[PDB]
Amino acid sequence: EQATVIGLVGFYFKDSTFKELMFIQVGEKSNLMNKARINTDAQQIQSIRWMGNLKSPQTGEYRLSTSSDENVILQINGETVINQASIQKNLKLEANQVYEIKIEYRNTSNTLPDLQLFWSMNKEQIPEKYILSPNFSEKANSLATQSFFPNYNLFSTPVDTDNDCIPDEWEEKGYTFRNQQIVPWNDAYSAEGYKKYVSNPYHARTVKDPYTDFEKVTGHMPAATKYEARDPLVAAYPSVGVGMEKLHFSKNDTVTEGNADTKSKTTTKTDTTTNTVEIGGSLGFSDKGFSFSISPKYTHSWSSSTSVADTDSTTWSSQIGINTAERAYLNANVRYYNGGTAPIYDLKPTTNFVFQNSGDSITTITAGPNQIGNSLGAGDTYPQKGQAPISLDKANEAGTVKIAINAEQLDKIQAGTEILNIETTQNRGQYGILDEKGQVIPGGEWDPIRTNIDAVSGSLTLNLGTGKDSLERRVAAKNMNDPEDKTPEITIKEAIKKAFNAYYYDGRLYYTDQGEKDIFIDEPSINLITDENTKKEIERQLNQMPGKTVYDVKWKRGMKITLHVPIKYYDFETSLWYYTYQESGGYTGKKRGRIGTDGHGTAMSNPQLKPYTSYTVRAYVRTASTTGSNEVVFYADNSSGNGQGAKVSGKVTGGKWKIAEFSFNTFNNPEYFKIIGLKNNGNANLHFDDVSVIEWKTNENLQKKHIFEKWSFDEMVIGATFTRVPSSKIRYQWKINGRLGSIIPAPPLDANGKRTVTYGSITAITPMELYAVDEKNDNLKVKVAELGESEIEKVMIDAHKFSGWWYLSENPNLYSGLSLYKLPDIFYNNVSSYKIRVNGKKVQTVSKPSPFLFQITFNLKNPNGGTYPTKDASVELWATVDLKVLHKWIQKSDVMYSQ
Ligand SMILES: [Ca+2]
Ligand SMILES: [Ca+2]
Ligand SMILES: [Ca+2]
C-alpha cells in the first residue's frame, strides 16, 4: 500500500487564463509542480489550479505562505488568504479538523517555477502528512461545495458537469492515465499499453459503483483491486464463492480425514454454466459466420459445480459398508475464492451445498472473519494458493455439523448423476475506501452497491479451464429507456476487452494471466455461452447487420455471456496440419492453412477424447476465388470420414468466410473420432483457419457400470440379468440376429439390485445382442450383453438329459428305446431332426419325436439292424441345428422302464 495518490489534484492549463487544460496531475503533496514535470508538456504551462484538503495538526494559529506569493491566490474554505501577497491574514484552525484548499497560480508571461507551501504558529514548510485529497464523493453532484472547473477563475473555460474533475469534452472524446496524470488520449498511447477511457459526462459514477469515475481511473481505491476496475466502465464488484477439493464420508458421525472408516475422494470446482450446455444436433456449413451456445441453467460463477472422477473400482456405499436404510455421515474440504475485481472486507458468507437436478439442500455453513480472514482479495483465495484446504468444521462458525445422505444419493454422486452444487450468498460484506493516510478502511455495505451496479450493466465471465478460477466482470451499458443517457455505448468486443484488461496482437484480442499462459479470446478463438434472453437480443441485432459476428453487436444492459476456452485450437500461424500449406492471409491472424483440389489435410496431434464426453468442432472456410464451387467434408473420424465417427458433408462453398461445425458424443468409443480433418474436392482452392475443439461434460459409462449374470429362458422368453447397472435413466435395444428391435425402456429393479431385460416374440433360442441406449438420444447405443452361437450350442447340448432305457415285459434282456427328458419349447423348436447310431452301425436319421409328456423317446430296433440291442450296446444321439448329444452304453445300472 503506497498511497502516493493522496494529495492536491492539480489542473495545468497552457495559457494565462485557465482555459486550455493540458493535464491533470493527482497526488501533489508540498513541492507543487514538481511531480508533474514528468510530463513533456510541463514547462509550457502558465496557469495552474490545485484543489484539495489540508489537515490542521494542532489547535492554534497559522500564517500561510508560498514561493511566489506574487502570483498565488489561495483560498481555504472559499475565504481568500493569499491574494498576490496583498494580505498576511491570520487563520485560527482547530486540531484534527480538515479544510478545503483552492490555489490558483498565473503569470501573463514566463512559465511558472515550482511552488512551495509554508506553515507558522508564531516560518516552516507543510509536511506531506497534512496534505490530503479532495473529498471526491461529496464534491460530486452538489451545488453552493465549490466547483473543480469554475468559469470565473479570480485572476472559453472547460465545462465539467459531474464535478468528478474530468471535463465533459474529455469524458466523451477519450482520455487515459499516463505518468500518474490524466491526459487527453491520442492513439499513440495505445502502442505503449495505455487504455482509452471514456465515461459519462453527467454521472460521477458511470457504472454506479462506490468510486467516482476519477477515483477509479486514478487510484483512490484499495490496492488489492484488479487493474480492470480502473476503467470507469468496469465495476469494482466482488464474487466470493467456494469450491470443493476433497469430499470425505464415514459410516459414523466422525467423518474426519485421516481415520478408520473415513474414505476420502478428490474433487474439482467447475463452472456450472458450461456444465449444463446440452450439445444439440450440429450446424455444418452455414453462412452468417458465427456459432453460439445457450445454457438453460446459466449460473453466476460465485456458485461452483463440483466434479468427481469415478476412477473407483467399487460403489462408495459398499466402500464404507452401509445399506439401503443406513445413513452415510460426511464432511469436506473447501477453498473460498473471489472471482471479482474488488477486495471484500468483514465478510460473512453463508453457503449452500445442493443437488443439481433435485435442488435439495445437503447442509449449510456460515463462515466468519474468525474462521476465514478479515478480508478476501481480488482473485485471491482462502486458504491461500500454496495452502491446504480448510475443513467444513473448521470453516463453519457454529463448529462441526452433522451431514448425512443415504446410500442411494451417495453412489449417484460417484456416478455423476447427482452433481453437487455449492451456492453461496453475496449480500454480506464491505467495500474498501482510502482514508486520509492511505490504507483501506471499511467504507460501507456492499449489498446496495451490488444491486445498483447490476441494474446498469451486463455480466461477463471468463471460464478458463475446468479447475481454474473464473473471472466475474460487470460492464456498464446504455439506458435504453432514457432517450438521453450519455453512458457511452460500446460493442461486445469492447466490453470483453475492457472486462478482462485484454490486449491486442495482430488485432487478436488475448488474455494474459498470472501463470503467464496467454489465451486468444477473439470471437473465433473462444466459445461464447449465453442464457436464453441474451441469445434473442444478439440474434435480434444480427438480423439488421449483414456483416454478422457476435462481437459486433451493441453491448446492452442486462446481457450474460461466458467465454469458454477450447481444449485444442489450431490457428494457422506458426511452426500445424498434414498435407496443408501455411501460406498468408487468414480470417484472424496472419497465415491461413489451405489444401488443394483433392487436398486432404488432417491434424498433427489432435485432442484427448474421453469415453462419454461430448465435443464440438468448429472451423472457418472459404474458396480462394470468387464462387469456385467445391464440396468439403469436415470430420472427426478413424477413416478420413467414412463411418464410425462424425462427418459433416459440406455442399456449400463459394467466395467469402463461413463457419462449419459439428458435435458428437464419444460414446464408449472415443477412438472412433481419433483424427480431425478436411477433405476438399472441387473447383477451387480451400482456405480455412481457426479450427477449435470444445469439451462438454462426461456422463456415466453405461457399459462399465453394467455387470452381467445368467441368461434365463411353456414360458416363451429370453432374458438378460444384471447384478449391477448404471444409475442413469437408459433404454435397451435387442439385436435379433442382425435385425434391431424397437427401443424399449429400462425395466425396474426388484428385490436385490437385479435388473433383467427381456425379449418377447421369441420362438426358438437365437443369437442376440442387448444394447444400452441413451436416455434422450436414439443413436447412442453400446453393447452390454451378447448371446453367441457357441454358447447356444452348449445350451442345446445340455438341454438333452437322459431319462432311461426301455426294455421288454416279454424279454427283459432286450432293449427297445432310449428316452431323454422333454425339452422346453424355446429349445426344442431349435432342433430340426435327430441322428442316432446304435451298436456303432448305420447312422439313421429320425424326425423330432412327439413328447409323450415328461420325455421324448427314440427306438432302437432299427438303427441296430432288427435285433433289439445287445445288453451292452452303444447309443449315440445327435440332433442337428449336427451336435453329439449323448454317447452312452446300455447298462443294467441305468434307469429302465418296459411295456
Ligand atoms: Ca467529469
Ligand atoms: Ca463522469
Ligand atoms: Ca490465423
Author numbering: 10 to 131, 135 to 156, 160 to 170, 183 to 602, 605 to 742, 746 to 913, 917 to 934
From the study:
The structure of Vpb4Da2 was solved by X-ray crystallography to 3.2 Å resolution in the space group C2221 with one molecule in the asymmetric unit. Domain 1 (amino acids 1–263), which encompasses a characteristic PA14 domain, adopts a conformation of ten anti-parallel β-strands, six small α-helices, and binds two adjacent calcium ions visible in the structure. Domain 2 (amino acids 264–483) consists of a β-hairpin motif, seven anti-parallel β-strands, a partially structured long loop, and three additional α-helices. Domain 4 (amino acids 594–730) consists of β-strands exhibiting a classical β-jelly roll fold and harboring a calcium ion. Domain 5 (amino acids 731–820) has an immunoglobulin-like fold of six β-strands and one α-helix. Domain 6 (amino acids 821–937), like domain 5, adopts an immunoglobulin-like fold with seven β-strands and two α-helices. Vpb4Da2 exhibits an overall β-strand-rich structure and shares structural homology to PA, namely the domain conformation and organization spanning approximately the first 600 amino acids that include domains 1–3. Furthermore, unlike the PA domain 4 described as a receptor binding domain with an immunoglobulin-like fold, Vpb4Da2 domain 4 adopts a fold of the carbohydrate binding module 6 (CBM6), which is also found in domain 3 of many three-domain Cry proteins. Another key aspect of Vpb4Da2’s unique domain 5 and 6 C-terminal extension is that they connect to domain 4 at a structurally identical position where PA has its receptor binding epitope. Given this steric occlusion, the Vpb4Da2 structure suggests that it has a different receptor recognition site than PA, likely comprised by its domains 5 and 6 or domains 4 through 6.
In the current study we determined the crystal structure and mode of action (MOA) of the Vpb4Da2 protein (formerly known as Vip4Da2) from Bt, the first identified insecticidal Vpb4 protein with commercial level control against WCR. Amino acid sequence analysis designates Vpb4Da2 as a new β-PFP member of the Bacterial_exotoxin_B protein family (IPR035088) with Vpb4Da2 domain architecture composed of PA14 (PF07691) and Binary-toxB (PF03495) protein family (Pfam) domains. The Vpb4Da2 structure exhibits a six-domain architecture mainly comprised of antiparallel β-sheets organized into β-sandwich layers. Functional assessment of Vpb4Da2 suggests that domains 4–6 comprise the WCR receptor binding region and are key in conferring the observed insecticidal activity against WCR.
